[PDB]
Design a protein around this nucleic acid. Structure first.
Ligand SMILES: O=c1ccn([C@H]2C[C@H](O)[C@@H](COP(=O)(O)NP(=O)(O)OP(=O)(O)O)O2)c(=O)[nH]1
Ligand SMILES: [Cl-]
Ligand SMILES: [Cl-]
Ligand SMILES: [Cl-]
Ligand SMILES: [Cl-]
Ligand SMILES: [Cl-]
Ligand SMILES: [Mg+2]
Ligand SMILES: [Mg+2]
Ligand code: NA
Ligand code: NA
Length: 326
DNA sequence: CCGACAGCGCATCAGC
DNA sequence: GCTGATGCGT
DNA sequence: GTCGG
């Protein structure tokens, strides 16, 4: 992290614009800049040098100069002082609580971990489980623990139906030595863009994992997406492992590649690729890549047999998962 | 200038 | 009950 | 907040 100082400042500023200002476009702007600077292979020496990178303009260039001279940013110094901003920002750290509920809670006088705890009757299901595991969800997952969780998920999935295919994506598939959570892509031959021959496909898996005490709680659950909690089992006399966030996405088997491409990310890489796709005249989502007609309407699905085919369509050299961490 | 900024599943609400 | 708009995480 | 046309 050659420019750790600047990317943090930019990230903080982005968190502030989304959580407090509820100005999402500014949030993304800062996030892009932090991303492009994060990969810049030199230790930035000036705002001007930074403004050369795409995504960094006059304002951010200005901020980088203020940051390099003093080692800080006045705009953030003040923001840290403002009690309201500090509270809203803190509450958004509880999973399920976003910018609106955060400001709403503060309006009601609920602004500290302690406040939330005594007002559990004022949170929806997700916010409650999010508070329950506030601490745990802040901790990273060592890859080694990820490999162990993978064994359970894949082996438990095989026991349900040998035809299920569970692939761990997210930062794990990109090769990170630590993940914020485990992301699992699930496919089965009975569920395709053509037909759903078997109901309760995701449920069956969720059920099997709950039976073995892997899945402990559920944030939200539908027929194709599951957002919950899981925990690696521990040995006798062994301290327990922290509770971990788990996302499971059931995708039509004939749409695996657009699915695995999406779920591997990162989120910004996807954004950059989906933007570039548009400029090339295509639209990409987790299910397919379609062309864009003059009218501006998406056409029918283009055939895909590998992730690379999708890169080829938009004229981008193939990039391995490890190089998509933007 | 100024429109565009990736795309969408699930929970929850309002209006009916 | 439904559909649509919004919040949230994604 | 930044960008392309
Ligand atoms: O806004 C989003 C969030 C996620 N995604 C994709 C890319 C991301 O890698 C994947 C999994 O989502 P996570 O929130 O789990 N992120 P990731 O696994 O990359 O990082 P982390 O280690 O924080 O979980 O879903 C998007 O496309 N858009
Ligand atoms: Cl904005
Ligand atoms: Cl600062
Ligand atoms: Cl596909
Ligand atoms: Cl589609
Ligand atoms: Cl998702
Ligand atoms: Mg993840
Ligand atoms: Mg996830
Ligand atoms: Na620039
Ligand atoms: Na949150």
């Amino acid at each position: 992290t050659l420019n750790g100082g600047i990317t943090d400042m930019l990230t903080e500023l982005a968190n502030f614009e989304k959580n407090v200002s509820q100005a999402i476009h500014k949030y993304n702007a800062y996030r892009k800049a932090a991303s492009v600077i994060a990969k810049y292979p030199h230790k930035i020496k000036s705002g001007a040098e930074a403004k050369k990178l795409p995504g960094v303009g006059t304002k951010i260039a200005e901020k980088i100069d203020e940051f390099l001279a003093t080692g800080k940013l006045r705009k953030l110094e003040k923001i840290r002082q403002d009690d309201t901003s500090s509270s809203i920002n803190f509450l958004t750290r509880v999973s399920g609580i976003g910018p609106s509920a955060a400001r709403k809670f503060v309006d009601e006088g609920i602004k500290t971990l302690e406040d939330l705890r005594k007002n559990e009757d004022k949170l929806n299901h997700h916010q409650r489980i999010g508070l329950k595991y506030f601490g745990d969800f802040e901790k990273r997952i060592p890859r080694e623990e990820m490999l162990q969780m993978q064994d359970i998920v894949l082996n438990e999935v095989k026991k349900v139906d040998s035809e299920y295919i569970a692939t761990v994506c997210g930062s794990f598939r990109r090769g990170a030595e630590s993940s914020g959570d485990m992301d699992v892509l699930l496919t089965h031959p009975s569920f395709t863009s053509e037909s759903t021959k078997q109901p309760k496909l995701l449920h069956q898996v969720v059920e099997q994992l709950q039976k073995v005490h892997f899945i402990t709680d559920t944030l939200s659950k539908g027929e194709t997406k599951f957002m919950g909690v899981c925990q690696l089992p521990s040995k006798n006399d062994e301290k327990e492992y922290p509770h971990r966030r788990i996302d499971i996405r059931l995708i039509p088997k004939d749409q695996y590649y657009c699915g695995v491409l999406y779920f591997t990310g990162s989120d910004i890489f996807n954004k950059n690729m989906r933007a570039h796709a548009l400029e090339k005249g295509f639209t990409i989502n987790e299910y397919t890549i379609r062309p864009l007609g003059v009218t501006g309407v998406a056409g029918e699905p283009l055939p895909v047999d590998s992730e690379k085919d999708i890169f080829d369509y938009i004229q981008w050299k193939y990039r391995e998962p490890k190089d998509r961490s933007e």
